[PDB]
Amino acid sequence: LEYINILKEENGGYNFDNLKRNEILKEKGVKFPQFRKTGTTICGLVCQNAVILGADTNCSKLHYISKNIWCAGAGVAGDLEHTTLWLQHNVELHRLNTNTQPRVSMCVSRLTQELFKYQGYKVCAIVLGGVDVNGPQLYGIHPHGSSCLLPFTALGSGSLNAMAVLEAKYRDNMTIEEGKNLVCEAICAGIFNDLGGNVDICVITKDSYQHIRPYK
Amino acid sequence: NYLEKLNFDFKVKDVVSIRDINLEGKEKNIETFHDTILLNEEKNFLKRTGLIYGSQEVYKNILDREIVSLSRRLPGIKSSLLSLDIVRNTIDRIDSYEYMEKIDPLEPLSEIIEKKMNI
Amino acid sequence: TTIIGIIYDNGVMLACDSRKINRINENLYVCRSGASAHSQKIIEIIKHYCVSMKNENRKKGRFHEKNKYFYEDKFNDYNPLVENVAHITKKIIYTNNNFLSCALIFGGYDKIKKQQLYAVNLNGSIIEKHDFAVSGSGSIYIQSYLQDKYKKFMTKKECFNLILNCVKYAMHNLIRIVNITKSFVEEFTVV
Amino acid sequence: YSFSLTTFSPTGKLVQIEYALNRVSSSSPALGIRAKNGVIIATEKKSPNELIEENSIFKIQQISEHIGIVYAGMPGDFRVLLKRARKEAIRYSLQYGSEILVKELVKIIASIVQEFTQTGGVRPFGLSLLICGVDVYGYHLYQIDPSGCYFNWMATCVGKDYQNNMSFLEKRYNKDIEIEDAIHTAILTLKESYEGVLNEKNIEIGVAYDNKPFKILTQNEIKDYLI
Amino acid sequence: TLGPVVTGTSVIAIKYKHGIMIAADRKASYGSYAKFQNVERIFKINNKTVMGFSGELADAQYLHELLTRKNINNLSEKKRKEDMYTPQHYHSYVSRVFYVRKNRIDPLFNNIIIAGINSQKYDNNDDNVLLYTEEYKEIHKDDLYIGFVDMHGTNFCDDYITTGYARYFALTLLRDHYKDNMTEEEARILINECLRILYFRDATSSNFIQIVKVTSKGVEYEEPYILP
Amino acid sequence: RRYDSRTTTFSPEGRLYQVEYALEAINNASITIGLITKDGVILGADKVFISKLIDKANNYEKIYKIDKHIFCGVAGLNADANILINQSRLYAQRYLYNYNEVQPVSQLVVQICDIKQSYTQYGGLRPYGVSFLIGGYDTKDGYQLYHTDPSGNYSGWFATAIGTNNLTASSVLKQEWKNDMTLEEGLLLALKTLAKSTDTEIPKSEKIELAYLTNKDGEVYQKYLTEKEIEELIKLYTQK
Amino acid sequence: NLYDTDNIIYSPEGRLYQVEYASEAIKQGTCAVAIKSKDYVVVSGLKKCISKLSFPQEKIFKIDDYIGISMSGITSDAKVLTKFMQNECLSHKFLYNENINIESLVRSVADKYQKNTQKSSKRAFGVGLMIAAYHNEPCIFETRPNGSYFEYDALSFGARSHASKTYLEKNLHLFEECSLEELILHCLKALKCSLSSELTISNTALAVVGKNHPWQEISSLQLEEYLSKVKM
Amino acid sequence: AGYDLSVSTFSPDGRLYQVEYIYKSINNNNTALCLECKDGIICCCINSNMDKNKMIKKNSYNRIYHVNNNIIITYSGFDGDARNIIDRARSEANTYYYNFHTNIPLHILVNRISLYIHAYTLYWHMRPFAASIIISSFNEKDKGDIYCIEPNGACYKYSGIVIGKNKEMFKTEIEKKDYKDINVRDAIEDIYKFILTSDDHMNKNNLQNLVNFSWICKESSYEFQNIHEEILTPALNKAVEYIEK
Amino acid sequence: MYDRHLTIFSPDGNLYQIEYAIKAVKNTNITSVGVKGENCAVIISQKKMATQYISQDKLLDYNNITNIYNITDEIGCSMVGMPGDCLSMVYKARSEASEFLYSNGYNVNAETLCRNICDKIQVYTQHAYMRLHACSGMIIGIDENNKPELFKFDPSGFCAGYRACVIGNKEQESISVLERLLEKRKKETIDEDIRNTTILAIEALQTILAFDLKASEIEVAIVSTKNRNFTQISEKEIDNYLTYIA
Asked: What class of enzyme is it (chain G) (predicted)?
């Protein structure tokens, strides 16, 4: 396989120049500045024919994959931002090439393969969900690459209170306004209980979405 | 076995580069895993194809990939390699090796042609 | 995860606690036991494989001149063999056994060797069971019972009652059961 | 065994690519006008069998949110060039987080086309792409030939009878023209060289507005502009 | 490859006048569970060849597949009956495979025994080998053969070879009571002695015994039987 | 095998055949002029009339900028010129990245000649059919200008021309040229030789384009001429 | 005429040309003859001598115990093939500790013939070899430039091969079940008929192999005795 | 006329002259009969061009090989290309039982070999394979099946096929009676009669030296086995006695 | 010289290797019709061996002769052309379907498969290294919106949408004929339109090929919303349709 060597030589990728210098520096015993851990309370739920995600900030957690796919991240900010940009642009390129509505299953598969390729190094938890031809679908991606179609998901540092509230006050065929009220009953309660900012609500409809960054 | 082969070449210290600490043992660290990040995936793909469909499919795929890759510019100016992207079906996908960049220093262009294709 | 499987007459049944069952094929089924991401990845790969051999197994010309889920492929015309799926699963698990580790139980019907129930533990540990197959946590607490009531050709209703009792005892120390027959498959959930 | 089949002939002229230009001379017309409030691209799509789905045979395609593309040549080269142009657009998007400028994409496609003309054992392409777009630097309308040379055009026509079509466009074109007048001039130029009766489903028109995304006009809109 | 999970206990192989007799116990202990008691331990590569193991089931099954394909390659390019490889060839193949895995630091967790007959002057069933479905002939010890392959690729030849827990104490009984050219009854009694002390003096052993004979007739799979 | 072009192959007597035909392409392009002056380096060019609808504003297809202190111009195929100028930009910026200094023009023309010689000698692909006029300023030797070709040869030039009617431009430059020449005199000489090569008495403003590189205040600054200043220069030329 | 330019082009009759020219190159080589019996295969042959000052060019090469061959064509192809079968025999006796099947070696070299005549930028071997052995029975094999291996009771290559073929066919029945001395006498008479030029110690290459006798070229004294025996 | 000098190049009227050069070469090479019977199958290989060569050992040159001791494969083209394709069949069965543990079904094998032979007939530098290969097998439940890939890469299911010299005459001879009901033990006499009659080179003496056989039927438990000479010789005597009269 | 040998543009365009491949496809004269209805898509071909050096014989299982194949489960295809090239293109389409199913996690679409095969044939045409596949396919499939889709490509690589088309010899005038049948369709339950499209396709093949077309020389297959799985209709049902048409 010589052509793959040619492809590797011509194309770029992850450069690895400063491994040894960092090994010497960490072995010599000096503390280095920490990462921006943007892991806060995030949740989502499968409402009546529309996914309703939730998060909290002024870092807007609600990120855009497609006109009918939004997501919320929890972990390292750079990993979440780059992976979200990659997924959004991959789906956009597929939509341009294939000319079909985006599907949540394709996003789930791509995120699962990408996170499974890096076993635990990429701290990246995403609660991606949206509406496709098969209706609304919400997923619970983990940093080990294990998706699961749950009726409602709550991840983050203060995920316990949000998950408990959702398990207490979840019902099928719920109204969109009741969905927003339950979303605050999870996220706002988790903010005031767990050790912030402004809540974020965005209903993911099949078309004509809406984002509410000053939700509360 | 490993570590190249001594042949009394007598040119061990070059004026372009210095030997690595591991020479060619290639100790398993993150850069080593990222080096064999695309070769392993295509090995898995050829395994799947030539298993389920027959090894002639893997033969046709390798010859097509080598033929389209053989159609490229000389070393120096970067080659688009569009036909390779069509054959390997990576034109639809954008991946980490497509974006990002490595800036690259001491070798004259003629030494690169000698190193690339053995002249 | 308590995954259970017993072979009755003219069909097999399998069960799991609570999505451990996955439809690799209409006439083949598998339950998972191990890590989440690894078990999803291997099941996706084997789903792709078994679908691919189902696609390629169609012969050239014309021949043969609760939810209920009759096979579209009549007479097992081009259904892949369960043994082939189980052994390629063995090969993939064994080639990556230094890091990949799952305990999958397999089951299905085939025209050649009839009803079958295979087991795939950690590493390449294939073994064909003609009577029953159980693994996972808490299996020993039910294991003697699995060697208690199975006579030789105990029947469908007895198997339903017995596997319900086994899964209930294992859980005590939502049930869902898939039965696979020559003509159809039925998946049904007992609360 | 790698050698170049596109070799400099006696008296130069790089004859192989010139044969590709003959294919560009034998292709259906595909024009475009850069208006003061937008940019327009138009084409003549044929009805060879009368059983074709008019939607399926696209010629005026979209790369980015404000970048269209039309061609005059064989369809496969258009498809692969479109796919690689899209991949380069998303590559710029991840590299820099913005819509790709028209000049950069035109330069990249010109480099790729020249690469294929120069590369050993592969023939040149058989189409003349016609890029259009809008960006912070205003409107843009370029034309990548099989030779790879790119020209910053304002109103151009490529295909059969391209000289007469360009002369007709130049006779009735001005720098300050509205989007509607530009569309009418495009329709008139397409109807000038058709060799038949022009009507619905025989042309496709794409327009990129001063601020709206690049939209391909539907059949009803094209029929309305026809009247 | 990483470590033992599903392991057997032992297998006892001896020679006698008409051929080799080798006996497993059909056990696959899942650490401390004893899930299975009907596992096929002793395989059959072809006529006049048997490959027993004592260790990880996956490594043994992979070696079984490798030896089976070597036999199918052999049959696929067969002209005479003498072209069949002897047990020495298969034994050297298993030794080389174990040595190669030892070099790679991917050890095969098994203790293999390769047994059979390295000649065809007695039997004539290999001219017409049938893969998918009289009286015993005496065979000299020289024409018989049995071998061993360790974790580290160590190999040798002997009259009687044992693996696993049998290597400690059952080897003493074998050295005490083994005689040249024994009768089938006395040989089976010695096997019963070895396996009853294995059953009594081990936890992972079993009493549901397998017996298989390698004689001039070929490979003969005697039925399972519980020890007395 | 039977379809081999055999590019990298000597002629019967002494020459590479394709390299000659490439040179003939250089003899069949729009004329490009290059000059050295006491306060800059002038490099004009003649625009081929593709059509009147070409966007004249900001479509300088002859002269290009390789670096903040280096520019060039072409007299051959523009598609090859784009890639070669891109590679020249990459080498200049990599030199500035590694060594932390502005690229000397001699090294840059040596490297682009190495590109053209690699296509001349190595492999079987056809050579690069374009000739450059790289010129600029550096502290080593002040103002400089060079003339590369597909054969890889290069040399300095106080004043030179390439393209169609290059002999007439060289003859005009031989007579009217001085060492202590101001920028305006060099621009007027560029207008005169361009008009002589084009055979027209009055140069047409739309049919030409000009540029220069001034080193005022110890800082390099390239200026590319637009239509208004071209018209002013032509008006002053005709009035003198 | 036009289709012989490359070794991947067949004529209108469906026939190679480069392979046929390799066969003609084998036909241009010197003579060699080998005869088997019940448990003994003699392999004799001439040895080319360019000039009186030059000593003869050695033909026979021993590959392994009970394995030795004779070249009848290009020397470099013979050297490469001898090296390959030497490596194969030594590798088989190394890894498995047993003698290699002669059929497997013959099939492997004929496979290499197939690979080297299949692809372009390659040429078939201009040499034919007697892959003779006593793998529990006397055998003589022959691999052609086209990928193919054949087996005979006796054989001749090039020069006056017609005379040797006629003599061997005439006396084919005496060759089976005969003593070693009679087999040596018949093979040397066949080589003498090939000469039609006389056999001497230098140019003759008598070699004997069989039961309780590995491959070993006979000494000068016994060779002189045999050439005296055939002479009278 | 230029287009015929390369397999890759297309003729002006859409017919690759190189492929018919393969067909002519195989048609001017050794013949190969095979057919189906009630008990099993029978494939025959006749070596007529060896009649001049009176040097070959008794029945040593065999053109009929087997895979897995279940499948028969034979050919008529050049020996080396056929052996390469045979080793490819062995490798395919090897990989199949390695990675799936089940014996390769026959349609899988013939399809993969068909695309493998075709995989050389679309490039420029590799010599195209010159071999027409007949694969066959027989099962008790499935009766029998005989495939035949042509050198172009065209696989068709045949009840009976003949390839090589005098192939039309042999196919005419086989079609005289329905051989589905005729047993494998009795068809040897008819095959002997056809090769003695259709082929001019084969005299009475050459029938035993330069002919090969193998069945797959119930007598050998549906597995590969060559005919023992004690079975061939009475059939040879009966055929010679019938043809002499 | 050698302009017509390799895939070279030649004077005044007209890449001639593509035309020779198209003519080679036409020389096989296996007419195969495809028709698209409403919630149904019938594909019909001829069970005849392609024209070549060899000839058909009585000792040949004619059921094995076939030109219609399955890509994965729902999207079928019908290559007409050379024997090896047709099945090679079938395997290439299968490989593209496997790529899509493995990467994107759902079944491939007919349009995406057609464009991918068109791109691969484009790579074959532009590169003179490899011979062009002389086999024109005819792909059908049900989209995610539960609508039929008919598609076709050529050795040129012109993937385009269709509603009724034909591949093989005499494809020029037949374009009119199918349109007339669609005129009959211009002037209902699922089974009703299924039966109507099936008999219309059989009548189209009867009018084009112009002979009786006995039941042992037709292979019919349909993908509809009722079933959605590519299945070949049995011989007796084809005979019933033939008798009903007459």
From this structure: hydrolase
